[PDB]
From a paper:
The three prime repair exonuclease 2 (TREX2) is an essential 3′-to-5′ exonuclease that functions in cell proliferation, genome integrity and skin homeostasis maintenance. TREX2 belongs to the family of DEDDh exonuclease, which was named after the four invariant acidic residues and one general base residue in the active site, consisting of more than 17 000 members involved in various DNA and RNA metabolism pathways.
Each monomer only consists of protein molecule without any metal ions. The residues of the active site, Asp14, Glu16, Asp123, Asp193 and His188, aligned well with those of E. coli RNase T and Exo X which are the typical members of DEDDh exonucleases, suggesting their structural conservation.
Author numbering:
A (entry chain B): 5 to 46, 49 to 158, 168 to 226
B (entry chain A): 3 to 159, 166 to 228
Write the structure that this text describes.
Amino acid sequence: PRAETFVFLDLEATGLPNMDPEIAEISLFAVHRSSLENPERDGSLVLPRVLDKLTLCMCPERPFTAKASEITGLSSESLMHCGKAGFNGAVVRTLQGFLSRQEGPICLVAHNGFDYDFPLLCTELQRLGAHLPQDTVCLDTLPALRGLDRAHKSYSLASLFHRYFQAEPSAAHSAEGDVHTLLLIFLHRAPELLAWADEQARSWAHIEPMY
Amino acid sequence: EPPRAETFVFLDLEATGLPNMDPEIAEISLFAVHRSSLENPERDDSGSLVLPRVLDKLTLCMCPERPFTAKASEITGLSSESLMHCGKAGFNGAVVRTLQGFLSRQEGPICLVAHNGFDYDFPLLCTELQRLGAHLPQDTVCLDTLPALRGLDRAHSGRKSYSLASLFHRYFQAEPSAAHSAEGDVHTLLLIFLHRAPELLAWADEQARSWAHIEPMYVP
């Protein structure tokens, strides 16, 4: 069946250079298909009114690089300072609760998801023996937008956003901010991407962990 | 005497009407903020308040069992049809699992913060949770910023209104960038709080009420 809810997400992680990646922040925006089929506009795009959201910070065991600390604006010490544990059972219960609130099937959407977000999410969940609904699929907007453009450049969020909306995203550089920016980009090309999703979305069960 | 809270969970409800019609939650948003973010409010180089970077957020929409009022649908921008079109169930087990997971991610004790909470948000949340037999963490306390701010102003000494919008306009002299939504209203509330953080933290430390002492608005 077609996915009924699209769950846009972004992860911020550290420790990748050690091949010991550990999520520091995750943000998810859940949007029903109908909202994407029929975008709202004020003349510019605005986000759907009916939108579920979950943003959770986690103190990673491994440190950010100074480049990824200036951008994201996190430090491992500061997440600790605000009293956050790591990616644990409580994160899993919250996430699974959140996903159960969505009409299935779910399509996870992440920019550069196949190379970063999805295998990273997969590693953390498998570490905790946690599974998503077996009908869950996922969509990486990076190859989608490349693929679509070829059917007729930089493919970063920053660049894509500037090329579709004339201006720079005032969205803070965070997981939540990045998902905001991604959802707008998706909305701007929604009929194409919905079509891409129907034909190209990958089963979540196919996704392999880092490990 | 209330415990010292380590996490302040700012929340707003968008409901289907006023108390007299046994309203239901159509939207809940929560912003969880560690006490230290409130004790030292971060400001950009231009010197204006900004939101804390370590900020957990949860926003959930729900289709009510009974209809909206005309006014509530207008205020909230939600309707039963739209929530139903988007496949949202009512306030159910899944909502409770998500909320309880979210709260368990916070360093306790937790102080819930809601504007006009003692009269509306807390008794409404209490009704919905009690209907499902759900409990919050044992030492949870509550702060209502409306009587808190009125009380602080009486001691410290305008202006007349203590509505959320009035307070934001007075303190920041601009319209909120909020979306006239639960999340937008929590955002507006957190900024109001930050504007008077040490006063309100002190108030909470001595005046915050036990969640366990909150009564349901009605029997569902």
